[PDB]
Amino acid sequence: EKDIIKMLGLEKAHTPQVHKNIPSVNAKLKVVKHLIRIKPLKLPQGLPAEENMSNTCLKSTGELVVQWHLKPVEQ
Amino acid sequence: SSFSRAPQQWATFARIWYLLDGKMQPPGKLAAMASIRLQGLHKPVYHALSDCGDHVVIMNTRHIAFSGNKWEQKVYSSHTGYPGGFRQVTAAQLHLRDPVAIVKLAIYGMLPKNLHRRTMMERLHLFPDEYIPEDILKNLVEELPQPRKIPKRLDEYTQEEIDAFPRLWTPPEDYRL
Amino acid sequence: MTGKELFEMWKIINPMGLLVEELKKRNVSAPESRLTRQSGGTTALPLYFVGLYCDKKLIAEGPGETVLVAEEEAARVALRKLYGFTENRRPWNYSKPK
Amino acid sequence: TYSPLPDDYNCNVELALTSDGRTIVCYHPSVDIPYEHTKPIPRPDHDQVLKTRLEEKVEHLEEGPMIEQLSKMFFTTKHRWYPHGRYHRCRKNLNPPKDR
Amino acid sequence: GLDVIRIRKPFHTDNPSIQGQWHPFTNKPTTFRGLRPREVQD
Amino acid sequence: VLADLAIYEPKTFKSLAALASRRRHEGFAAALGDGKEPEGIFSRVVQYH
Amino acid sequence: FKNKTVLKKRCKDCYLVKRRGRWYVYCKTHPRHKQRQM
Amino acid sequence: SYLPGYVPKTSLSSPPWPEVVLPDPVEETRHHAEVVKKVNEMIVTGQYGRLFAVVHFASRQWKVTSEDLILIGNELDLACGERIRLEKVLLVGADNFTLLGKPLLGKDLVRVEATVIEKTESWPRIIMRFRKRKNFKKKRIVTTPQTVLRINSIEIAPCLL
RNA sequence: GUAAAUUUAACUGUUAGUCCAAAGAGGAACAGCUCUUUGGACACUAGGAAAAAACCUUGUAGAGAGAGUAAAAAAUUUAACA
Ligand SMILES: [Zn+2]
Numbered sequence: 094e095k096d097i098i099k100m101l102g103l104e105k106a107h108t109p110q111v112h113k114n115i116p117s118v119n120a121k122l123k124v125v126k127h128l129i130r131i132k133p134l135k136l137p138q139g140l141p142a143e144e145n146m147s148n149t150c151l152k153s154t155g156e157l158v159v160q161w162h163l164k165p166v167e168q
Numbered sequence: 169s170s171f172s173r174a175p176q177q178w179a180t181f182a183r184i185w186y187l188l189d190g191k192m193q194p195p196g197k198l199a200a201m202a203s204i205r206l207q208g209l210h211k212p213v214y215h216a217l218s219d220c221g222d223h224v225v226i227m228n229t230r231h232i233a234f235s236g237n238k239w240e241q242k243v244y245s246s247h248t249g250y251p252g253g254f255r256q257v258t259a260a261q262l263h264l265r266d267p268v269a270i271v272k273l274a275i276y277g278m279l280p281k282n283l284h285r286r287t288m289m290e291r292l293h294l295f296p297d298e299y300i301p302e303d304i305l306k307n308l309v310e311e312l313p314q315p316r317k318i319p320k321r322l323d324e325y326t327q328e329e330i331d332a333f334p335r336l337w338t339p340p341e342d343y344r345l
Numbered sequence: 346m347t348g349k350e351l352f353e354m355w356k357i358i359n360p361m362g363l364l365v366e367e368l369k370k371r372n373v374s375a376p377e378s379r380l381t382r383q384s385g386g387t388t389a390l391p392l393y394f395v396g397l398y399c400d401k402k403l404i405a406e407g408p409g410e411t412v413l414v415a416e417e418e419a420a421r422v423a424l425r426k427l428y429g430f431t432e433n434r435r436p437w438n439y440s441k442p443k
Numbered sequence: 444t445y446s447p448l449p450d451d452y453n454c455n456v457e458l459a460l461t462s463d464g465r466t467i468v469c470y471h472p473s474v475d476i477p478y479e480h481t482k483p484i485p486r487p488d489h490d491q492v493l494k495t496r497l498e499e500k501v502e503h504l505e506e507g508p509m510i511e512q513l514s515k516m517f518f519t520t521k522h523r524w525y526p527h528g529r530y531h532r533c534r535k536n537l538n539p540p541k542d543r
Numbered sequence: 544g545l546d547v548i549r550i551r552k553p554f555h556t557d558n559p560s561i562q563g564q565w566h567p568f569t570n571k572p573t574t575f576r577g578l579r580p581r582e583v584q585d
Numbered sequence: 586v587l588a589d590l591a592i593y594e595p596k597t598f599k600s601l602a603a604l605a606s607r608r609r610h611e612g613f614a615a616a617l618g619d620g621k622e623p624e625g626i627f628s629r630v631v632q633y634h
Numbered sequence: 635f636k637n638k639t640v641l642k643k644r645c646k647d648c649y650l651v652k653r654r655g656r657w658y659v660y661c662k663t664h665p666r667h668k669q670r671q672m
Numbered sequence: 673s674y675l676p677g678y679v680p681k682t683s684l685s686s687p688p689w690p691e692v693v694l695p696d697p698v699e700e701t702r703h704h705a706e707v708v709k710k711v712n713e714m715i716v717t718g719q720y721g722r723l724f725a726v727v728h729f730a731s732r733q734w735k736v737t738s739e740d741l742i743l744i745g746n747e748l749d750l751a752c753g754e755r756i757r758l759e760k761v762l763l764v765g766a767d768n769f770t771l772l773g774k775p776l777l778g779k780d781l782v783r784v785e786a787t788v789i790e791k792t793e794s795w796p797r798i799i800m801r802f803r804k805r806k807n808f809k810k811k812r813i814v815t816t817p818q819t820v821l822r823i824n825s826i827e828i829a830p831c832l833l
Numbered sequence: 834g835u836a837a838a839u840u841u842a843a844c845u846g847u848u849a850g851u852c853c854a855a856a857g858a859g860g861a862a863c864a865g866c867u868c869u870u871u872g873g874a875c876a877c878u879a880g881g882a883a884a885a886a887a888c889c890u891u892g893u894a895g896a897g898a899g900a901g902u903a904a905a906a907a908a909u910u911u912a913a914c915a
Contacts, residue, residue, distance in 0.1 A: 170350075
């Protein structure tokens with residue numbers, strides 16, 4: 094179980110990591126499924142582009158926004 | 169408060185005399201509220217290194233109420249140090265011999281186990297009855313509310329409340345009762 | 346004179362007597378001293394809060410170990426408020442003049 | 444007539460919100476003690492020929508009774524009233540730093 | 544130029560209180576005629 | 586900050602206590618309802634994007 | 635009085651009674667049927 | 673005259689806490705505007721004295737007022753004497769009025785400015801580790817950089833409405 | 834998915850181990866008992882089980898008078914009777 098954690102890049106705790114939903118990767122997850130929290134990655138704005146790399150932010154809900162404005166909603 | 173430096177310091181670190189009525193009250197709940205006042209835990213300026221404790225006056229310590237069978241089951245044990253000097257008395261036996269021992273022991277067991285515990289016991293005053301010396305009575309400030317609300321006896325209910333409460337059953341007329 | 350009180354730099358004698366004169370200039374009736382808070386009066390560590398009342402209106406409240414000391418300090422509190430040298434006053438403006 | 448806390452002892456707290464809801468306004472004017480809740484200060488406290496000259500009343504008391512009298516008037520224990528040795532009296536900082 | 548020694552507090556203010564430093568009577572309501580608990584007047 | 590406010594700013598701390606008490610009462614009212622009633626005035630949350 | 639963990643009546647005259655915190659078996663006809671809960 | 677959900681008054685019939693009725697939101701909404709306008713009217717006329725502001729700086733919340741000192745345990749890369757503005761203010765309070773940010777106040781409502789007056793290293797701190805019977809003993813001395821800021825002024829603007 | 838592995842060169846040092854979980858032996862379906870196997874911890878830090886090498890939480894190292902969390906507080910009152 095320790096080796097699989099290193100292979101998945103989960104050394105530091107409470108550090109989100111993005112992996113592909115494929116059977117080979119899922120095979121490793123099913124071994125350490127009791128040591129990790131699995132959430133889907135949602136894209137309300139879609140895949141980040143080249144111009145949106147510097148404005149990404151992964152919220153706690155699992156959604157990755159491409160426009161992190163740090164500004165209260167006017168609505 | 170635009171006070172001078174010395175009067176401002178004196179007022180903040182002043183001692184306030186509080187009053188407690190122990191009639192029909194559990195000793196522990198009396199001790200819990202007396203513990204914080206004696207240690208000064210009720211003040212935002214509280215600190216262990218600062219002697220910020222206050223004076224607690226508890227009256228009617230003879231008429232305390234023990235929940236359950238604590239009058240018969242609870243045992244206060246002490247040892248005189250000599251062989252065969254192990255004495256064990258119940259709460260009822262101790263209460264008759266000393267009306268203020270039960271409250272004093274409950275409060276003493278709640279203070280921190282340090283050298284300051286004996287200092288805080290000097291600022292605690294116990295009186296078995298409602299009689300209080302004038303000097304202690306003339307410097308009281310606030311009467312802390314009783315923790316436990318005394319239930320009313322059946323004879324203390326007025327006719328308005330008795331008639332307000334509905335009867336749930338109709339007894340037969342031929343029942344001797 | 347930042348962390349210094351008004352009377353800490355201006356040493357005076359009998360602040361109560363000077364308070365009466367400043368109220369006469371403003372057509373204010375003589376203040377009445379009454380006890381608002383009291384604790385440990387019979388003990389060696391008392392606390393008195395003497396409150397100055399003009400026309401049954403509180404103008405200052407001061408603490409003290411004894412009644413005379415508390416009354417004397419309460420007079421200083423009233424003088425600070427009248428002169429505007431309270432601790433609540435806005436700090437000195439050191440910004441560049443406009 | 445709703446009030447989260449009784450406006451009787453400390454101040455009259457009036458909660459409010461801004462139009463955008465990005466700032467909470469708290470208007471808390473100080474309350475004054477009513478004139479009817481105070482007590483007046485106790486201002487009040489023969490054929491004599493010889494003037495009453497001040498007479499010293501410092502009665503000699505042993506170390507025991509002196510500490511017992513002090514422990515009762517200040518409601519403390521006898522332990523703090525005993526002196527300490529030179530070693531502890533020399534470790535004490537006679538010029539401590541002062542703040543405010 | 545001050546000595547490089549331990550500093551007791553990371554802050555220093557000459558007027559720490561603006562609404563009045565806390566005193567035990569700050570949060571205690573006043574009673575009619577300021578009577579003490581279980582005290583009878585006249 | 587709250588410890589400093591409770592000592593040097595008693596009036597400000599009472600305002601925070603009133604706000605916390607008001608918010609505490611709003612949650613109890615919302616817990617009694619089934620969501621039909623609108624949320625409390627102080628229960629609104631400013632969203633950041 | 636014989637201490638028994640389980641109290642059993644030994645005749646029709648034995649009757650159970652709750653006294654002083656423990657059940658007792660009394661039998662006036664047969665005084666040897668008296669038992670005390672252990 | 674008893675409803676199907678009626679319970680006679682007993683000890684546990686009703687909750688021990690007294691019932692609390694919240695104000696009508698429609699009626700209370702305009703009541704808030706009256707309080708805000710009064711407090712906003714206290715700012716244009718300058719009916720306030722010293723102001724204490726709670727600012728978030730160096731991952732720390734400081735209860736600062738005017739003309740006071742604060743020690744910061746890191747270097748700001750700023751020459752001494754430079755005047756800067758502390759952007760994050762969470763609370764501004766006065767003798768009679770208090771404003772709360774959610775969680776921060778707008779830059780158009782409060783302005784706090786400080787000055788770099790002294791940049792110095794900390795006093796030597798002893799970092800020593802020891803384990804018995806293992807010949808494990810090593811001593812390290814560190815001097816973390818420090819910075820002292822003095823709050824010059826705390827001013828607000830009438831932008832509540 | 835990851836970044837190690839093998840070979841080459843040069844030698845030192847450790848191997849009188851413990852306890853916990855699990856499978857199975859010897860003893861008495863005893864032992865802080867003995868003897869193998871798998872795994873963990875311990876001889877590496879800290880928090881929690883009262884004090885605590887072996888249980889649980891948790892590791893990569895500094896300063897802070899900031900913050901969010903992990904494990905983490907024993908329950909129970911029992912006999913009538915045709
Ligand atoms: Zn029988």
